[PDB]
């Protein structure tokens, strides 16, 4: 099969977004290959001076549309529509004019610029999990999308959840969400979409909505504070004000101090 170009619903489209690794991301001007189904995207990319080669092993192109088009498939971002000729299409519906890359936290919706450094947990409206009996069970943010689905807000932290494809999700408990976040962790590893990480128990505070876990890697990152105890956080955040920047504190310079003492001791006797 060879992909074809279609121009249906062109007047309802404001822009285009790329889907890479199952997660929507912004389009760079230097990207070289895409999977495309629209002829207008050629003009959209030529106006910015870009060129590309079409291949199936490259991120797909999806268009932001102001009209409800297609239906919802669990585990896939946006909506999927099949043309009269059998070709599939992808679109990004919206409710308000503020449109961007949108991902789903277990309780709230937050827009992001990059998946790697955001609070994203899931990127699909509906997700399906394997129950205790080994059978698939549907879940959705809104239960009206599919009958029998369970709301995302009913989920709880520190509980192991397995999707029907074998993936594992584990997110820690939080007490504040938004521009500033505070998190609590146990002595166990936590995993999210595509990445799992090991962390120790404690509490962390972040000045940004970036993903934070209690380990040395996130500890070294700027704007992140962590502590082994509730009160130890203040000591940790106040330590750098008197502690030097690094390991420049070489103790070999005490020879000069010892020389002054030896010199004065000899001089007094003489």
């Amino acid at each position: 099969h060879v992909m074809s170009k279609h121009t249906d619903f062109s007047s309802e489209i404001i822009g285009y977004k790329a889907i890479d690794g199952g997660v929507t991301r912004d389009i760079a001007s230097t990207d070289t290959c895409f999977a495309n189904k629209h002829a207008d995207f050629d003009t959209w990319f030529s106006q910015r001076g870009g060129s590309y080669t079409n291949d199936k092993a490259c991120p797909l192109i999806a268009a932001v549309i102001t009209r409800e088009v297609g239906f919802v498939v669990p585990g896939l971002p946006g909506t999927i529509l099949r043309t009269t000729n059998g070709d599939f299409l992808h679109f990004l519906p919206r409710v308000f004019s503020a449109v961007g890359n949108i991902c789903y936290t277990p309780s709230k919706l937050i827009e992001y610029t990059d998946f790697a450094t955001s609070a994203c947990v899931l990127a699909a409206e509906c997700t399906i999990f394997k129950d205790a009996s080994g059978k698939p069970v549907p879940y959705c943010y809104d239960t009206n999308v599919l009958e029998g689905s369970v709301a995302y807000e009913s989920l709880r932290p520190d509980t192991r959840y397995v999707l029907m494809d074998g993936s594992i999700i584990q997110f820690p408990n939080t007490y504040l969400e938004g521009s500033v976040r505070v998190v609590t962790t146990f002595d166990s590893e936590y995993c999210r979409h595509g990445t799992c990480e090991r962390s120790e128990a404690g509490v962390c505070v972040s000045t940004s909505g970036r993903w934070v876990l209690n380990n040395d890697y996130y500890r070294s990152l700027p704007g992140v504070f962590c502590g082994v105890d509730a009160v130890n956080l203040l000591t940790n955040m106040f330590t750098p004000l008197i502690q030097p920047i690094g390991a420049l504190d070489i103790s070999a310079s005490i020879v000069a101090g010892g020389i002054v003492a030896i010199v004065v001791t000899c001089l007094a006797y003489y």
Binding site: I242, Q243, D249, I250, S251, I254, T265, A268
Partner: protein, 100 residues
């Protein structure tokens, strides 16, 4: 101690405190690599304690502290130390050559 006082004349008092402070600073520097809290709080305590000494040993103590602890202390601690040492002369200079 009597034998020590037999020699060194009048300067035994200056020598004793100079040796004791050097030994204390050497111990603090030896405990530095594990306990990172020491360079700041110990310097602050030393600055507080240096007031209760005679000027003769105070000058040596200031010289030793500035020679030894300078390369491993934050800048603002040093500037506060300098300001606190030099206020007693800034007051005199301002009174005698600037004040009204």
């Amino acid at each position: 101690f009597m034998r020590f006082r037999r020699a060194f004349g009048e300067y035994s008092h200056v020598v004793a405190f100079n040796t004791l402070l050097f030994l204390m600073s050497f111990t603090v520097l030896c405990l530095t690599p594990v306990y990172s809290f020491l360079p700041g709080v110990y310097s602050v305590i030393y600055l507080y304690l240096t007031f209760y000494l005679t000027n003769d040993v105070s000058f040596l103590a200031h010289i030793q502290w500035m020679v030894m602890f300078t390369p491993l202390v934050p800048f603002w601690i040093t500037i506060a130390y300098i300001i606190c040492i030099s206020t007693k002369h800034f007051y005199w200079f301002f009174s005698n050559y600037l004040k009204r």
